[PDB]
Every structure is written in C-alpha cells, then in structure tokens.
Design an enzyme around this catalytic site. Structure first.
Site, mmCIF file in Angstrom:
data_model
loop_
_atom_site.group_PDB
_atom_site.id
_atom_site.type_symbol
_atom_site.label_atom_id
_atom_site.label_comp_id
_atom_site.label_asym_id
_atom_site.label_seq_id
_atom_site.Cartn_x
_atom_site.Cartn_y
_atom_site.Cartn_z
ATOM 1 N N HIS A 171 2.065 4.978 17.196
ATOM 2 C CA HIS A 171 3.087 4.165 16.556
ATOM 3 C C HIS A 171 4.461 4.599 17.046
ATOM 4 C CE1 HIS A 171 -0.360 3.448 13.963
ATOM 5 N NE2 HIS A 171 -0.352 4.725 13.624
ATOM 6 N N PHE A 225 6.457 1.363 7.911
ATOM 7 C CA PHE A 225 6.078 2.302 6.867
ATOM 8 C C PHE A 225 6.957 3.542 6.946
ATOM 9 C CE2 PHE A 225 3.863 6.001 8.604
ATOM 10 C CZ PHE A 225 3.610 5.616 9.904
ATOM 11 N N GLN A 268 3.636 1.791 3.046
ATOM 12 C CA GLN A 268 3.693 0.735 4.047
ATOM 13 C C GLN A 268 4.098 -0.590 3.413
ATOM 14 O OE1 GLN A 268 0.112 0.162 6.522
ATOM 15 N NE2 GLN A 268 0.710 -1.989 6.751
ATOM 16 N N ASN A 273 1.054 -0.516 13.440
ATOM 17 C CA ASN A 273 0.311 -1.519 14.187
ATOM 18 C C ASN A 273 -1.186 -1.316 13.996
ATOM 19 O OD1 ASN A 273 0.134 0.861 15.621
ATOM 20 N ND2 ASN A 273 0.901 0.032 17.558
ATOM 21 N N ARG A 291 0.831 -1.198 0.000
ATOM 22 C CA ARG A 291 0.000 0.000 0.000
ATOM 23 C C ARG A 291 0.867 1.251 0.000
ATOM 24 N NH1 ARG A 291 -1.353 2.252 5.055
ATOM 25 N NH2 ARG A 291 -3.313 2.861 4.043
ATOM 26 N N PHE A 318 1.605 10.923 1.162
ATOM 27 C CA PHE A 318 1.339 10.596 2.557
ATOM 28 C C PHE A 318 2.323 9.578 3.116
ATOM 29 C CE2 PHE A 318 -1.775 8.375 5.618
ATOM 30 C CZ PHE A 318 -1.228 9.047 6.691
ATOM 31 N N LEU A 337 0.595 11.571 13.777
ATOM 32 C CA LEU A 337 1.099 10.213 13.991
ATOM 33 C C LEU A 337 1.835 10.108 15.324
ATOM 34 C CD1 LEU A 337 0.688 7.931 11.779
ATOM 35 C CD2 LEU A 337 0.522 10.251 10.839
#
Ligand SMILES: [Zn+2]
Ligand SMILES: [Zn+2]
EC number: 5.2.1.8
Lengths: 86, 208, 93, 163, 208, 163, 86, 93
Positions: free
Chosen positions: F125, F112, F62, F101, F54, F59, F121
């Site tokens: 994570h 990622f 991953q 996760n 993906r 952005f 973020l």
C-alpha cells in the site's frame, strides 16, 4: 578419638574423630588410627584441615558466617584434594 | 565513517528534565532490545484436579501446580526434590519473605536463560578450562544442582567461576506468561545485583 | 567464644581449641596425651618471651578476634619470618 | 542448493564453540559467492585468523578485516570493492548476517551479525545470511562486548571451510 | 480480497500446547501493540531534600516525592488535597492494603490515559449529551474530581456514564519509568475488571 | 507548501470532534492530489456523508466508500482506478494515513488510518498522510471498533474542506 | 422539628429537620417551616426525599450499603432537581 | 433494624421509621401531630383487613427485609393496582 593423616611430603596431622567423620573417604576408611595420602600437597592439606573445624563449629549457628579466605592462586589446587577427599 | 555505528544518537530526544542522556536512557533501551526474543516461555500441559505447567527447557525442568482453591488468591505450588512447596500468599514481615521462597526465584531466573546446560562433565575445570559459554547466573545454578550443599565443591568452583560477566535481567521480564495473575516477585536481588557467594553456598537444589 | 591455637613443630602441626579464661594446665594436659611425657620437659613459649604455668590465656594476649579459626595463632614448645626448630620422635610400641 | 559455511570460535586460546551460516545464493549470487570464496579461501587470502574488532552488546558484532585487522581494510574476489545489490531481503530479528559498508556502494569484506530486531538497518546495507546452528555461541561472543565497542578479550576464528 | 485484513493469521504459530489460537493470543498481541506509544510518562524535576516527580499531563497533575531515608525501601509520598501521604512499605494483611492506597492507583491509572480532560463544562449532560470522547475510566475520574464525595451527583452521573467502553490496560504498563525500583501494585481491580459503582461513590479526589 | 485538510466526525448524530490531516505532495503528487480533490469535492462527488465501515481496535480504521458505502466501491478523478506509486515513505508508528487496495495496482478511494507501529504494511500500500491535530479523536473513533470489524454505532463525516 | 416542601403540581411533603439540614439550599432558606419549589416534579421530589433518610441512616455504618435503585428513565431528570437542591 | 413505613393519602405521602416490636400506638401519636385529631377518627388499615391497636407490628406482617428504605410499604388511613382514596383538609390558623 584421634585420627592420623599423612601428606605427600610427609606432613603428618592429628585430627579429632568427630571432625574426621565429615569426610566421606575418611569415614569409609575408618569404618573398613592412621590414614595415608599420596598426592595431597602439604599446604593444601593444611588449608583443608581447618575447614573441618570451621564447618563443625558453625554447623548450627548462622549469625554472621564470616567469609572463608581463599587466595586465587591456591583455589586451583584446592579442588585437587577436595574432589579426592569427597 | 568506519561502519554502521550511527544507532539512535540523533533519534534520541528525551531532554525533558531527565538530563544525563548518554549511558542512562541508551542502557535501558539496549536492555529492553536484547531481552525480547531471548529465552524460553511457560506452557500449560495436563489437567487433573489442578493446573500444571512445566515450561519448555529440555534440560532443566521446573514443575508448577495451582489448585482451584483460594477463592479470593495464588497458591502456585512447585515441585522441589520430591515434594510440593507453596510459593506463598501473604507474609507478615519481609524477613519471612527473604529466606522462605528464594529457592524458587533463584531456579526460575536460571531456567529462563537460553544456554547449553547439558553435559556438565566434571572433568572440566580440571586441566585449566573455564567454560566461557555459560553466563554468571547459569554456571552458579549448574554448580548448585551438581554439588552437595556445604562440601568443598560449591566454594572452590564458585571462586573459579567469578570472572564470568552477569547480564541484567529486567523486572518486566520473567512475565508475559499465559497465566493472567502470576505470583508477585518482591525481591530484586535475584535479577539485579546478583546473589553473593555467601548465599549460593547455603542453597538446596530443586533437582534430586 | 572459643579460641583456636596451634603448636607447629619441625614439619607437623597440632591444632586445638580452648577458652580465653582457661589456663595453660589443660593445654599441657593436651600434649601429655601426644608426646607421652611428664609435665617437666615442656615449657610453652609465646613469641620470644617465657610463658609460665600460673597465668591464664586471658591476660597472656590471646583474644577471640586475633585467634579466629580462619587464622589460628601458633605458640610452639621446647624441651612473622622465622621461629623455633627442633626434633620430635615418634611413639614407640 | 543453498551453500552453507561453518566457523570455529576461540576466545584467547581455548576454543568456545562452532557456528553454522546459511548463504542465500538464488536471491543474490554476487555477495553470497564473494562471502563463500573469502571463507573457504581458494585464492590464498581468507577469513581464517581474523578477529572480531567490535561488538555492541544486545546490538551487533562486526568483523572480517583479514588485511589490516583494524576495521579499515577490505577486499573481494571481484576486486578491491564493488557496488551494492538488491534490497529485497529485510532484517527479520536476531542472528542475521549482513555486509557492513562505510558508505554507499562501498561493500568490501567487513560483515556483521545482528542479534536484535533492528528495523532501521534498511536501505544502507545488504543482508545475505542467517545463522543455522550456534546461536548460544553468538550470544557468548557478544556477551564480552562493550558500549564503546572495545573487546575485553580477543575473539578469533580458528578454522574455516565449506560443508 | 476486500482490503488489508490479512494481519498475522498466517504468521501466528503458537500451537505448542496452548491451543485456542484465535481470540486468545491475538487479543494479547493487540493489547500489547496498542499500548506502546499511547499515554504520558513520568519525569523528574526539582531536588530539595527529596526526589520529586510531577509527570507530564498539563491538566491533571500528580506530585510524588521520595526521601533519602528507608535504607533497606520505598516510601514514595504523594500529594493529596494539601498534605503528603505515604504509599506504603509493607502491609500485614491484604485487608489493610485494599482500602488504604486505592486512591493513589485510581488517580494514577486515569492520569496516564491521553484524553481531553479539560473544560468539564457541567452544562454538558444537561440537554442530552454523553461526551463520547472520554473513556470509561476518564469520565469516572472527572466526576470524582468535580463532585462532592457523597452527594446526588456522583450517582446520577455514574449511571449516565455507563455505556462508555473500557480499555484494558496491561499490568506491564504503568511502568518503564526512570525510577529503577518503583512501588509494587498488588491490585488488579484498577486495571482490569474496573471499579464498581459502589467504590467510585465513596472515593475522595486528590485535587482540591 | 504542503496542502492540509480537515475532517469533522459525528457519532450517531451529535458531533465528536475535529481532525486535521497533512498531505505530502512533493514526495508523491498523484495520490495526494487525488485525496485532496476527493475531500474538497470540486467534481460533485466527495468524501462528505461517508461512513467508516470497518475499525480494528488497536490496529486501524478504514473508510472512504462514498459510492456503495459497503467497502466494495472506489473512484478517482483520473478514472475508475489507477496504478501504484513510489514506496519511498514507510510507516512510522501510530496515526499514519495510507490508501488501501484489494490487490496490486488497484488503488481507488478506500483509505485507512493506522494507530499502531505496523511494520508489515510495506510493499502493498501507498502511505501519504499523517494526522496533525486530533489524535484523541482518532482514539475515540477507534475505541468503538471490534475484532470482526463491525461497528457498534455509525461514525460518519459531517463536513469536509481545505484550509 | 418538621419542615414543609411544595412540589410543582402541589405535592406537599413534611420532612424531619435533621434530614432537612442535609440539603444546602434548604439549610440556607431555614437559616435566613415552609419551603416552596416551582419546577420540581412530584415523582422526582418523592424519589429525592427518600435519599435523605438513606444517607442519614447509613452515614456511619458501612457494612453492606445496598445499591440505590435508580431507573435509567428517571435518572435524566433526577439531576434536574439534584443540581438545584445542592 | 428500623422499619420504614409510608401513609399515602390522596396526593401526599407521610414517611416515617419505627421498630418491628414497636406497637401502633406511637404510629398513631405520629399522625396526632399532623392531622391534629384525637385518636378516634383514625383507624390504621393494612392491605384489605382491619388493623387493631392492641397488636404490634412484629406479628402484623411487617419485616425489615420487606420494609427496606429502598421500597417502604404503605398502609394508609381512614376516617399493587388500586388503593383507598379520600380527602384531607389543611391546617387552620
Ligand atoms: Zn545464560
Ligand atoms: Zn482515556
């Protein structure tokens, strides 16, 4: 042809009627010779009288339009008569 | 220390060849930081034979319309007084530009600033009040809207409203609207080095 | 290139406009319709020196730049720091 | 539930406007109660009569020195100074209220309002309030600031109290 | 869930009257987010009888000069081949605009993108390689620089370089330079809806 | 001191480029050691032969599912899964490496790389790596992504190892 | 006036010299009649021959300039002869 | 408005340009300098119908749009899917 203006302290002025019709209050009084004012200061009236000719003479021409000299001290009470006249 | 007055003095790098690091790059950074979430934005409502916008102000409206004509341009008619006027598509000389559409940009700059532009209350400035809430460019617009074009009330009020500070609005601002083309603003006098007293004294207000 | 002039007497002022080439005969005619007096009792004064009827305003010292409407000059009449002071009666019925 | 406070601003005599702050008490009781007590002034000393001693335009506005009026003061109901609190809250753009400390665990009474999306004000100061009404007043106050922090005019608080 | 694919679906508010919330506001937000710290910037070096800039690329240079003349404008001469050319100050018709300065903007757009624009290695595309590293607008610039203006090498290579994707560069980009005035770009074809094959086949490269 | 790793990218056969990652071990030993062990593959299973399943353009990107190759896998040298770590590190713009996760305390092997200034973020994570060389390669990989996350072509890793 | 071209498989062409001077290699060979090529495919040579007239005819006029039709399959080996010729 | 035409025989092709109003006499003159034969053994063929010398290309069916340089037409000569096939000897010393 000529209209008469009276200040607070008795300062009396004569103005050409063509410049006189510029003011709304003067136009209303003449439509309804001699005009009397009660609280208008003499110096303020002298300052405001010249603006009529300044506007009439420079109504059409827009070449330079030099800035109108107003002292900071007198501007506070210039509006005093400006609001009442217009 | 005394407080949080670290900012990005250490994080400022520049120094490639620009030099004069203080007061030049920091000024631009502060100008960009201040003008992110301040002001209003354009919005699209209604659609009858034309795209219409009226912005989100609530006190100082501004109506703009764009037809489907001009298949390769930008008409962008806007409402003034009681008639629609064309912003312009192409001007032969710069003289024809400055003097035919300054009315649009002058009102556009003021309408984006977020200030209390209600209750003019002409009884102000009568007993010694200055109305410090408004900016330099906002009180000028209020005077233009609420005064006859050439009487002795646009002049005394402008003199009494000279001490107000002016905020520099960046050129990249007044943009980022939903419209993907927008008219081009080929005039920097409205946003920086603001209008002189001799130009605000001979300007007709859009509002009636 | 109109030149604006003032005649300030006692407390009142009379303001008018003329031409630099225009003589003072028409200036006297202007006050003829104000004071209602024949052209004998009035003698125009410039500063502190006598002004005659036969000399026009062009060489008298009046200039458009120095007689701008923003600050018109004053000459006065007769029958800086200080100037003349006199009397004036009002018009009779 | 959440207590609220109101401030009246005056710029060199004549008033300018009124602002309202909302204080988060559930997430942090200590600093919210301290700020409310200092604002309402139930122990004599209060925020009334203070002066915003530094304004950075487009950045922030600091004030709250009611003892020395020079930025070197500070007091609290608990004592002269206390230690920090939880850092759960984070800055979320303009018009956010947070206490300012010279060093770690040195929170007194000098607060400041930020009117920008400052992301690096994390891990050093405790943020506890947000403006409810009067953002234009905050902009009007901040427009008189300067890069050096000097104020061209005296911006003071005329009245304080709790709704 | 499966991963971090929350983003700002909940934090997106809009909904005033714009509607069509997905794929319209999110696209603009992503375009703005991607173009913040990507690319190069203009820098000022040297000063003899004129202000000179040469940008920070290292592989695809671009020299611009501005004299102290034009006391109310923007000359902004730039070096092409071996001579200086004026960007332009005012054009009577749009036809005179599109066709006299597109060479400047075409090279300006490519010179800002951050890509490995070295070792052209004409031996590529010879045994079945496509050079996927470069963008659509970067390989076109490389071909223009390294090929004769009208031979059968700008045409075959352009056909072989059609599968590369194009990245939309916002209009507010290519700005924020230390220069406070800058020329105005009255042409959107270079940044969105990129150049057609018929216009890259008749363009002269700045480099010699 | 700080270990480093290198990756070789291949887009549908012919290679595209090489990238280098720097791993922070002093600030967090657990996840850095896990990533290094998975990359070098001293226990048989490794990151070689995986595929970026993906990519969100502008952005993030991953990958790291070497078991199912569908994004639902995950493994580690310590075990099937472990718990979180310290959140001292924060995202500092584009080209930053962090484990992904599905839920809290559910860190497996799906990492990622973010190529944008993503500030939200945080608290979900663990971020542990940053790209040293090959940012243009990261942009070239990410340019083939899509809004839905589908990839128009297969981007795989050809070789793995530790410098 | 007329120059001779030979392909790989024996496809032999005659070209007007004015169009022949367009190619650099052809110009060099003529300056230093009959020209032979070894690895140039017949179809590729036929495709490339027409471009000479297309360029010569439309060298000055720039009214429409219709697009040159090139199939994706043939473009890979079109450069094979394009590089050698120029 | 030049019209581009081809004559494709056996394996080789001969390409030329002419005018729609231009007759086929000059077209025959073109191949006169190629085959070195008198104008008797050559008869121009269009599609599957006989073409005469006295009729120009204007009404024969040739148009600039259908005879563009991108895809010139072919007529051939004598002594879609399929067309004529014949022999041609090379020039003798
Ligand atoms: Zn404002
Ligand atoms: Zn690129």
């Amino acid at each position: 042809m000529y209209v008469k203006l009276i200040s607070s302290d008795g300062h009396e002025f004569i103005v050409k009627r063509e410049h006189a019709l510029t003011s709304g209050t003067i136009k209303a009084m003449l439509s309804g010779n001699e005009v009397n004012f009660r609280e208008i200061p003499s110096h303020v009236l002298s300052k405001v009288c010249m603006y009529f000719t300044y506007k009439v003479r420079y109504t059409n021409s827009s070449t330079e339009i030099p800035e109108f000299p107003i002292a900071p001290e007198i501007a506070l009470e210039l509006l005093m008569a400006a609001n009442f006249l217009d | 220390e005394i407080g949080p007055q670290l900012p990005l003095w250490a994080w400022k790098e520049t120094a490639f060849s620009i030099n004069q690091e203080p007061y030049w790059y920091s000024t631009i950074r502060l100008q960009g930081l201040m003008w992110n979430k301040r002001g209003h934005k354009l919005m699209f409502v209604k659609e009858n034979q034309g795209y219409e916008y009226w912005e989100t102000s609530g006190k100082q409206w501004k109506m703009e319309i764009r037809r489907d004509l001009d298949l390769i341009r930008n008409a962008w008619q806007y409402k003034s007084q009681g008639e629609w006027k064309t912003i312009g598509v192409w001007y032969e000389s710069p003289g024809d530009y400055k003097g035919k559409e300054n009315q649009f940009w002058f009102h556009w700059r003021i309408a984006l600033c977020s200030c209390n532009k209600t209750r003019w209350d002409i009884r102000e400035f009568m007993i010694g009040k200055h109305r410090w809430d408004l900016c330099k460019s906002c009180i000028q617009g209020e005077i233009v809207k609420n005064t006859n074009p050439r009487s002795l009330q646009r002049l005394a009020l402008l003199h009494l409203a000279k001490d107000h500070v002016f905020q520099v609005m960046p050129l990249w601002r007044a943009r980022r609207v939903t419209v993907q083309k927008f008219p081009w603003c080929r005039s920097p006098m409205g946003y920086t080095i603001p209008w002189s007293l001799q130009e605000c004294w001979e300007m007709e207000s859009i509002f009636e | 290139m109109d030149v604006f002039l003032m005649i300030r007497r006692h407390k009142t002022t009379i303001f008018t406009d003329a031409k630099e080439s225009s003589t003072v005969f028409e200036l006297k005619r202007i006050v003829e319709g104000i004071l209602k007096r024949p052209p004998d009792e009035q003698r125009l004064y410039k500063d502190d020196q006598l002004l005659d009827d036969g000399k026009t305003l062009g060489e008298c010292g009046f200039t458009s730049q120095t007689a701008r409407p923003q600050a018109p000059a004053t000459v006065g009449l007769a029958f800086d720091t200080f100037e003349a002071l006199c009397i004036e009666p009002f018009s009779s019925p | 539930v959440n207590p609220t406070v109101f401030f009246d601003i005056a710029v060199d005599g004549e008033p300018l406007g009124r602002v309202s702050f909302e204080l988060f008490a559930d997430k942090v009781p200590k600093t919210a109660e301290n700020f409310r007590a200092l604002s309402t002034g139930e122990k004599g000393f209060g925020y009334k009569g203070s002066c915003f001693h530094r304004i950075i335009p487009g950045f922030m506005c600091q004030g709250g020195d009611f003892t020395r009026h020079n930025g070197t003061g500070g007091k609290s109901i608990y004592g002269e100074k206390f230690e920090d609190e939880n850092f759960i809250l984070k800055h979320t753009g303009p018009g956010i209220l947070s206490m300012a400390n010279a060093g770690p665990n040195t929170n007194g009474s000098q607060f400041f309002i930020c009117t920008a999306k400052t992301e690096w004000l994390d891990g050093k100061h405790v943020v506890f309030g947000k403006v409810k009404e009067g953002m234009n007043i905050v902009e009007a106050m901040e427009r008189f600031g300067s890069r050096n922090g000097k104020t061209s005019k005296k911006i003071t608080i005329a009245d304080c109290g709790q709704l």
